[PDB]
Amino acid sequence: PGTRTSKLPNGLTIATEYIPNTSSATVGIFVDAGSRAENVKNNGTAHFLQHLAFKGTQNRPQQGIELEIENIGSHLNAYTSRENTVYYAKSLQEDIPKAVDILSDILTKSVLDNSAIERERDVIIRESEEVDKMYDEVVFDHLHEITYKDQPLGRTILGPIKNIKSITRTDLKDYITKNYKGDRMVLAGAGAVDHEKLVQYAQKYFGHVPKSESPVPLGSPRGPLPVFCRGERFIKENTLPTTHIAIALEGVSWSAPDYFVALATQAIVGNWDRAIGTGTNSPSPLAVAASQNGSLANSYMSFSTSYADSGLWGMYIVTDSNEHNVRLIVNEILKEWKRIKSGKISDAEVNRAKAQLKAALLLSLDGSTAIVEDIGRQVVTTGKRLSPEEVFEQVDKITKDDIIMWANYRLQNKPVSMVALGNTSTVPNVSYIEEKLNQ
């Protein structure tokens, strides 16, 4: 009843949530690594590794992993973020151990064949060319680069083409050696799962993983806090039909006391699409203004990103490159943040937001996979798992006042960074934005 936890002698944490009336489950290994653990010439390795982990291990050739997984009807997947590397599997309860076995095998005993490493450089490039076609993706990568100027969080996950062509098997093995420590990973599972047995299998297949010499609890500070840098980057692209803008301010980290309050505020501003509306029965003054007299943009989306020691909070805008004066939609957005700062918000919209927030964080924890996602990410970036009931509590206690306070702290006399891609001529300055916001 709740989430069971155990720690292996090498530092590895095993976190579990049993789900009654199930015969299948999800198990995943979460490693506090990701691109924020790389350096400038290193940049892109963790992702490169993820690709190779599926090419063969010291115990199983590539096609061997595939066929074995497909024969027991399991599923195997992985992903890399700026904060971590995750490998996970979905399978019938009978195969949980087989699953743990294979996960550890792919993570730590991967071959990394030189032929494989060279063929893969092309795939990764191809992948890079695809991200370049997703304007939102592009804008947010640039935003991270200037906001976290010359810092780990400022680098992308894929890395520069330059690095994709230069990463060497040595780079790969070093990254593994440096980062893969028991005290830096979590084996999370949910579904038809026995915690005690899973801890055993953990020891059996992951026990061989090295402890860091200077262990630190998963939650403890990586080191010097990332620092938010105000800045702007205009990327002129007259050929683009739509223009994309992202405006941010230093946000909140995963463990921040005001974490949920920040999400609550994001939800009060919400989103809007020129065609669909808000997806709310009652639109905000901002949404109404956006849609009036011809529309001021195609869409806007409030966003919030969190990391263990930092966060970004802001707006993402999409405008018609030939029809919209970006200045006008930016003004309305700043007007809306000021509305919140001046307390001019209703009980009803505050309640609407808390309800939106609770559903988004809780009703979405439906299958074992989503639950493993939550267990894993929380423990690996925070050191603990707030339970669904605890999160409910955190959201439910938020007051109109909490929000007004938070906005007045984070959106008044604080730096902002911005990125614009497309028809830049109509986009306002970062000093323009702070002037109007603090005004």
Binding site: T156, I157, L263, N271, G279, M301, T305, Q356
Partner: peptide, 13 residues
């Protein structure tokens, strides 16, 4: 999309 949160991630999708 429709309403919330948004971090970056690459997947062997």
């Amino acid at each position: 999309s429709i309403r919330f949160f948004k971090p970056a991630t690459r997947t062997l999708c």
